[PDB]
Amino acid sequence: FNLISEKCDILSILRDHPENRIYRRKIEELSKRFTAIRKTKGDRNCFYRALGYSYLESLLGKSREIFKFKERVLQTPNDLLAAGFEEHKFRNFFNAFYSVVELVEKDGSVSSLLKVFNDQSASDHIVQFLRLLTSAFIRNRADFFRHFIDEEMDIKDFCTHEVEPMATECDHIQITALSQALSIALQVEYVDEMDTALNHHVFPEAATPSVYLLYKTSHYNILYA
Numbered sequence: 001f002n003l004i005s006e007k008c009d010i011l012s013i014l015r016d017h018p019e020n021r022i023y024r025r026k027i028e029e030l031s032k033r034f035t036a037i038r039k040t041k042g043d044r045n046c047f048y049r050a051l052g053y054s055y056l057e058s059l060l061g062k063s064r065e066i067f068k069f070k071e072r073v074l075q076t077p078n079d080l081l082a083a084g085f086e087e088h089k090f091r092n093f094f095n096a097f098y099s100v101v102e103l104v105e106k107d108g109s110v111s112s113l114l115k116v117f118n119d120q121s122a123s124d125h126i127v128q129f130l131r132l133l134t135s136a137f138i139r140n141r142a143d144f145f146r147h148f149i150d151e152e153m154d155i156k157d158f159c160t161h162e163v164e165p166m167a168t169e170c171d172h173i174q175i176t177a178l179s180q181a182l183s184i185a186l187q188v189e190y191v192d193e194m195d196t197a198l199n200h201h202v203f204p205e206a207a208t209p210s211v212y213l214l215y216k217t218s219h220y221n222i223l224y225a
């Protein structure tokens with residue numbers, strides 16, 4: 001369980017911040033709203049890995065929702081082609097992601113899904129697919145990211161340097177784009193060491209979330225309500 005942990009009680013993370021009044025206060029407050037957490041490895045890939053595992057975990061046993069997600073995943077090669085990626089170069093990454101979606105349908109266990117996401121090879125192939133899809137989605141909608149996010153930014157350079165490469169950290173743009181690309185609704189809870197209110201953001205605004213993440217020390221962990 002080196003990439004995605006077993007579930008633990010929320011208060012188990014007090015030990016990561018001993019004798020810190022603000023982190024203790026915020027973790028205690030968090031525990032009033034969430035019961036359990038899974039930790040993810042801090043290797044620069046943790047957003048993609050956490051969102052992938054947690055969303056597919058949320059689909060287990062839901063036959064209509066699996067059928068609709070599989071239908072969307074079958075179309076994602078066309079998003080990659082339209083942004084200029086070549087099939088022979090994304091084939092290995094696409095096939096790894098389609099495979100774990102079929103596992104959710106056919107096997108349907110938590111234990112089998114957690115084994116794929118802790119397999120360094122399968123798991124890294126899944127993360128690389130998610131990063132190429134994020135890049136394609138932004139490239140194909142460059143005017144939307146310039147209109148709504150930053151009129152001055154260089155979209156192609158941003159995708160090349162801060163989305164495609166393994167171990168590159170995410171910001172709001174990547175979270176928004178991968179949410180939109182796979183129709184995944186998520187809520188991110190923010191715990192920093194400033195003396196402020198515990199707070200959260202929903203992607204997209206006003207959706208009912210599938211996935212809850214905790215963002216703390218530049219790390220995304222998985223929450224359960």
Ligand SMILES: *CC(=O)Nc1cc(C)on1
Binds near residue numbers: 041043047217218
């Ligand atoms: C999400 C992610 O990988 N975060 C992170 C923090 C540190 C340290 O390394 N990676």
